Ligand binder design. Structure first.
Ligand SMILES: Cc1cc2cc(C#N)cn2c(C)c1Nc1ncnc(Nc2ccc(C#N)cc2)n1
Length: 412
């Protein structure tokens, strides 16, 4: 019934961010949603004296036909003061990523039951644009905790704790984590038992008085991790050996003891690329030692919470993508691959967008925060099409790589 005082970072004004073009469908959806939100008092109209703006658009969650309002709060989130609660910060559960199965639940509607600090409300302003700007955009601001804002989980946390207390005390083995609008509940239980406990939890949440019927099931135990592998052949061409030496040279930036000398000795002389070259004993041994080295993990790879997670993605063709999450160059915290087909067969951007979402989810389950993506796409293409395929209630940060990486085929 009482609002907690909120302010921005020192020397920082509120966000002013242009509303990007919206399609007719999304505009109608947002009008219909915001009308009812206004009726329910969640939002209120504002006047010209509010300069601030945050972009808004519409999406659809996993397996649903219902439009959902998504506000992109990234600017406000980085401009709003770092919010440390009575918690003094929560250690991110390291058991969450070790659980057999992890279900994602949307708790977002709970935020709307808690009022927002009056003086900060002006900073949450947003616009529903009109087609061809033929009418003034409809301007709103939030009277309650907005979805997507950094302050909402921080503020609501004290409530969420005592809301989840009975369920947590009843099932102590279950690990629960909260990121933005999402509640991640992991456990080792069988899928049926898991789903029953999940239904139990959402029913318990609805009894606590808070679309929560959805769920998203991961399996961190079955997650993809990639060692560096070398080919095994009975016959090597000059080309094969050249590619091998290239890969080993690249892998020597990671693993110290990699030696290409005896293998490069075979490349001496100018021969046809397709000519078969028999391996000398020294070369074979060198290769063996190299494999041995490649089986061990990387030296001195640690996660530092003070730094940024960086995710790189490569398009390998045939609907296949490779990715690496890392902090420092050639120190890989995680690597993986996606062959996924969901409605994505002919569309590169749909694939890349789903990939970005999955990687972000993984990164949230593991380190409790989102990576900065380097996307193998032109800025204009991505900026144009990514919102069409976005199903997630959060958004990460991204940049663009316009020069083809040589390391592409070395990860495939
Ligand atoms: C009604 C309207 C009038 C108007 C006058 C001026 C000026 N100067 C700019 N205007 C805009 C943007 C309008 N808004 C609006 N909304 C939807 N359809 C239209 N069509 C339309 C408008 C004018 C003319 C003529 N002559 C012909 C067709 N206009």
């Amino acid at each position: 019934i009482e609002t907690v005082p909120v302010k921005l970072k020192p020397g920082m004004d509120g966000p002013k961010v242009k509303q990007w073009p919206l399609t007719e469908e999304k505009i109608k959806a947002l009008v219909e949603i915001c009308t009812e939100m206004e009726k329910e008092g969640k939002i209120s109209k504002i006047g010209p004296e509010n300069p601030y703006n945050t972009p808004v658009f519409a999406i659809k969650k996993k397996d649903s036909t219902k439009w959902r309002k998504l506000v992109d709060f990234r600017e406000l989130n980085k401009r709003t003061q770092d919010f440390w609660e009575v918690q003094l910060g929560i250690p991110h559960p390291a058991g969450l990523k070790k659980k057999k199965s992890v279900t994602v639940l949307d708790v977002g509607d709970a935020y709307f039951s808690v009022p927002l600090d009056e003086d900060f409300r002006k900073y949450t302003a947003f616009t529903i644009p009109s087609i061809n700007n033929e009418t003034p955009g409809i301007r709103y601001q939030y009277n309650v905790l907005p979805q997507g804002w950094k302050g909402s989980p921080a503020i609501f946390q004290s409530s969420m704790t005592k809301i989840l207390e009975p369920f947590k005390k009843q099932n102590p083995d279950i690990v629960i984590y909260q990121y933005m609008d999402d509640l991640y509940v992991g456990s080792d239980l069988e899928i049926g038992q898991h789903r029953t406990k999940i239904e139990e939890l959402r029913q318990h949440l609805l009894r606590w008085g808070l679309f929560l019927w959805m769920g998203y099931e991961l399996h961190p135990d079955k997650w993809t991790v990639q060692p560096i592998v070398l080919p095994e052949k009975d016959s090597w061409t000059v080309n094969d050996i050249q590619k091998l030496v290239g890969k080993l040279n690249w892998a020597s930036q990671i693993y110290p003891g990699i030696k290409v000398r005896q293998l490069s000795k075979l490349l001496r002389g100018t021969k046809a690329l397709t000519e078969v070259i028999p391996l000398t004993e020294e070369a074979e041994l060198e290769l063996a030692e190299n494999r041995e080295i490649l089986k061990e993990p990387v030296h001195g790879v640690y996660y530092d919470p003070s730094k940024d997670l960086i995710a790189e993605i490569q398009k390998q063709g045939q609907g296949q993508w490779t990715y690496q999450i890392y902090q420092e160059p050639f120190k890989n915290l995680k690597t993986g691959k996606y062959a996924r087909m969901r409605g994505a067969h002919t569309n590169d951007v749909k694939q890349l967008t789903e990939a970005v979402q999955k990687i972000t989810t993984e990164s949230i389950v593991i380190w409790g925060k989102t990576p900065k993506f380097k996307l193998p796409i032109q800025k204009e293409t991505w900026e144009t099409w990514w919102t069409e395929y976005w199903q997630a209630t959060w958004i990460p940060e991204w940049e663009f790589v316009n020069t083809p990486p040589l390391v592409k085929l070395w990860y495939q």
